[PDB]
Symmetry: C5
Subunit: 311 residues, 5 copies
């Protein structure tokens, strides 16, 4: 079979639509998500046209093998989509209405800069390669674009599923390619991060500051070193849920900065002890009293500065 013939020199328009059924498995480390959707295609083939009076029928059904079907592929998929044809229906003028249900693992990159308070735009790129007979261009049939109400992406809120109606038409290996951009806008459910990582991490930091109300070096060393180890465990736990980024993430910045607070607390604890031993407890008292205000104030201001730079 060959592609439909042109009336003039016009390209063949394949109208498209994606309707998401199931959306799942958003892997932050891999920057992939799995999709299960309907893919609808529509184009005119005059060779398939018929008289509804003479033929009796209003529409004719065909098996994929019987007629010409455009070779539509996804750009950013990992492997070729798993698809099963639902229906192929031809109207009297020759307008073909194709429907298939597919599943694919889509590879769309993520911006972790504001993690875990980030929003993403996942992409699904549809493409078509022009044949030698005639050039093929993609279009968006907006009535055949949508998502099921049940569509749930665990740990995420689905905001919108829309399509950029104008295709990106370009040359590739000396043939025209027509690319379409389907955008799924989502925003992370940050709630769990608060009682599981953020508040536990702040509690251990504040426990380290109880050393500013203690003269016992042995006890202070235990307080600041033990809590520093718990902070290392939280840093490790966090960096496992995320990929290695060439930029600083919001959580990454706070986690990093907190190390400096532990380091300065060890210095203060060491200075206090050295002074007490050197028979200068009055000077050590001044430093300890100042630290009680300095540490919380500097922590609070540094956090205002960070939140400002990131949001």
């Amino acid at each position: 079979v060959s592609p439909p013939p042109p009336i003039a020199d016009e390209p063949l328009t394949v109208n498209t639509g994606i309707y998401l059924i199931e959306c799942y498995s958003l892997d932050d480390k891999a920057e992939t998500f799995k999709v299960n959707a309907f893919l609808s295609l529509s184009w005119k083939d005059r060779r398939l046209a018929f008289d509804p009076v003479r033929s009796g029928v209003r529409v004719k059904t065909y098996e994929p093998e019987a007629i010409w079907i455009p070779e539509i592929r996804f750009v950013n998929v990992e492997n070729a989509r798993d698809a099963n044809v639902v229906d192929i229906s031809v109207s009297p003028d020759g307008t073909v209405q194709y429907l298939e249900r597919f599943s694919a693992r889509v590879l769309s990159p993520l911006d972790f800069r504001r993690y875990p308070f980030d929003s993403q735009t996942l992409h699904i790129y549809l493409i078509v390669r022009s044949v030698d007979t005639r050039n093929i261009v993609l279009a968006v049939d907006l009535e055949k674009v949508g998502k099921n109400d049940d569509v749930f992406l665990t740990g995420w809120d689905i905001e919108s599923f829309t399509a950029v109606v104008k295709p990106a038409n370009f040359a590739l290996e000396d043939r025209l390619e027509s690319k379409l951009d389907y955008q799924l806008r989502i925003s992370r459910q940050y709630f769990s991060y608060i009682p599981n990582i953020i508040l536990p991490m702040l509690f251990i930091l504040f426990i380290s500051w109880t050393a500013f109300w203690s003269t016992s070096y042995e006890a202070n060393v235990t307080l600041v070193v033990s809590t520093l180890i718990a902070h290392i465990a939280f840093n490790i736990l966090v960096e496992t849920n995320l990929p290695k980024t060439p930029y600083m993430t919001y959580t990454g910045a706070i986690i990093f900065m907190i190390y400096l607070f532990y380091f300065v607390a060890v210095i203060e604890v060491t200075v206090q002890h050295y002074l007490k031993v050197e028979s200068q407890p009055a000077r050590a008292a001044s430093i300890t009293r100042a630290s009680r205000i300095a540490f919380p104030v500097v922590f609070l201001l540094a956090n205002i500065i960070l939140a400002f730079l990131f949001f």
Copy 2:
């Protein structure tokens, strides 16, 4: 092949039934479960009708290829089900009896609010898309819905497997869709959580309270900080067996609240020491004596309040 013709303008009723053989791999993090069952279908095709006297046979067997079979799909499956046809049998009036054995990874969401004392309703949604010739509606043949006695879901108790007999009929891409709801009611086997997480977590908390019968700051700091680290390990262990929820789980609440008890214990230990050093051990004694009663009482009441809110 085309769908059976209507006697009048009535839709075609496809009677369904699911009989579970093997039920396994309930992933809490992924909110998926694997199923291995029989899918039975039954509809009338008058074109297949025959006289049992003339034909000799009481029933005729056909290969899927030979006759029209409705395109039945699962909504909430991850990928398309793995199915193998067991039998296709036609009675003299034209009643077709289809049977296939399938396996699928079903995606049904879970409510972790009462975890690990939770009960779930897993769903299996059967659907059918109407063709242009005629509208197709699903039905439940209750005699062909069940489960094997051996059916075991590790760490869960299987309560019931029933079907919501009235389908959810709706329009999708300007064609009628008939959806059916098969519900598998299960309840978690919480037993293991008690000697592995709950009791170990309470033991370490009670060990931290032995600091209220000690005047040694160095020993108290060690007692409260060491046990806090073991609590962090239990929080991490628990949050690995579960997905990130936009709500508070029962275990999540208890785990979180216990951090506050550790934080207040550090404050008491710090106050006691500061007072002893300031030559006020009588005042420190009053606070320590009070804490011995306050901590267990507040812990017990706070837990009554939590159990009340969650159950």
Copy 3:
């Protein structure tokens, strides 16, 4: 094709046999094992009968497509077995000899009560559904049932591979089903558990008891708390190699009971200190001296009681 016709009213007997080649991947958490075996089938089809004088050949070979083959399935498999036909040989009377080599992930439950000193009976269930023409019954050809000598299941000892010769004939969805039980008896290689978990766990417990020969509260607190944390790590390590059971396992019981010994050791250490501070070291000495005998004796007796209840 249709099933062979009966000489009288007798059912069709399909003789079976399983010969294990490779046995591997016993997942305790999943209660699955992988198998690679030969499945042999034999039945008589008079329609295939031939004269060896006229045909030249003594036996005729056929492709599965060419003749009727019974639809034999496994009950407790995860997905449908991967099978490849080795041979199909027909003798002049019409006796078909089918041979295939398959691989499958079998789902057979396990009893962890005596873990890691447990023995299991893995099951492989073969089944056949009767057709409308005639009822099909399974049989065991004992000469075609066995296992290779090289068959090794990592961390397990293979005791026997036998078949329950009488099939379970029952009704399912108004058709006769003939089920056969192939049993693989295995016993765990507990050896590694002793130097890796049991002895390390006992060493840390005995180290905690060196606190009964020490008057230093600060040192005792460190001894009992540090070793308790190592016990938590062993509890976590053990519960990762096992699924969540609605019963107590042998190792589970010992691990749990050892927490009580740590809890009572913390109480003794606290009492000793309180008494020494209260200027009653004589009474504290009596308690400490008693604990030196009490702790090992109670530990030894409690273990005799547990081993008795479990074995």
Copy 4:
């Protein structure tokens, strides 16, 4: 079908080109990467030649089955590539233009010596086996070799994608093989390693050195031992992201060397205590004062030496 016949005794030249679409999943432990690209092939088959005047058409399209296609394979792939034919176009002289889209898991080894400041050359080897009729030789059509601008390899910077134009022609299993080398030059994004591993590891080391300004043995023992354990955690974390190499990696060397600094710090702390107890605090003071300069200076010089040897 047979291969094209030679005009004379010349070999058949198959012109090749790889255009990367998606590049992903670089596993450092496995030394694999996944690729999704276009494979373009071109060769002359005089048997396919036609007159454009007589035939009407300028090019003829064929199904893979209709004509002879060279059996092109990848050497260093894990399993055989997943490929789907995009187009096959024949020009009047008989020049065939083949295009397929494929995906494969490529196995190319990595040099971790300068990790995480390393650069790699990933290889994709195309090969062809000569037939008895005639020898087949590969070539590079440079206009059909490239990569998409969107091509992103997480945690890596893609420098270049080029081909070694002259094939490696050699004998294998008594037939000529023509191998081509496609090279993807990449360099690691080391940025994340600095705030997550390098700086945290240096902070804990510097904290251990605060023991040179402390006379408290109990506090020093806690400082040096606790920080050594955090260093062990970083060593374990690092060796999980990497395979077992028969050489020393850059990070491996630094991590190893830091153990020696911890060991010498324990010796100093032990010596200081022994001397103070032996009533020689003046000598212990000299050693402690010297260590304050020695440790940072030796650490800084040893690091200059290492960076020099590795870069």
Copy 5:
């Protein structure tokens, strides 16, 4: 198609050869390795013989479907190999030369007794089942057995790839089977184990022995208990990279024995303290002084004994 006919009563000899292209993924826990190789087969079929003068051609190429091909299988593979036919060439006398490229996950057991200083012999077993027409026997064509120079197995050194030329001919299910043994001899690259596990483990042990130069019970308790916990972490890390063996491994023995050294160090530290408290520091001094020599000497001798028993 039927197998070639015998000239007399001789069996049919199928000459074999395996040439490794890529060798990868040696899983110690699973006792599996993945292979990507060429499988060459050669046998004589007189029915395929032709006169090179009359036919013009020197060799005839055939599609697998056209001629009889022996059913060759691998014994110790996990699932059936993935294979693709490269070439089939028939010489004038009827000698068939078959070539296919395959990939398989091979299950060959490992001996961890000398781990990580162990050497292994991986096996690839080729087998053939005799048909009723005639018995089939395997042979090794040594010129068609080999491996690529690039063949690299990460963390291993590939020593040799040879075949045991005499097949194992035996009866199985009343038919002859011809098994061949292909042996891949490899030896572990132990280098990484030294700076990552062995030396870190020895450093922490030697740190525990600094307690023999300290009179501070509180410091000693911290030194010996903290280092014991780091030893537990190394034991856990090691037992994760290995399966559960019914024998003692070399590393397993050293790791186990080191626990006894920690246990005796706790006893010495406890004895020293009890004696100092009992006002017997002179006796405690004798024990401590002796331990300084005893511990290193006994450690060194015990290790000589172990290395002797294992190597």
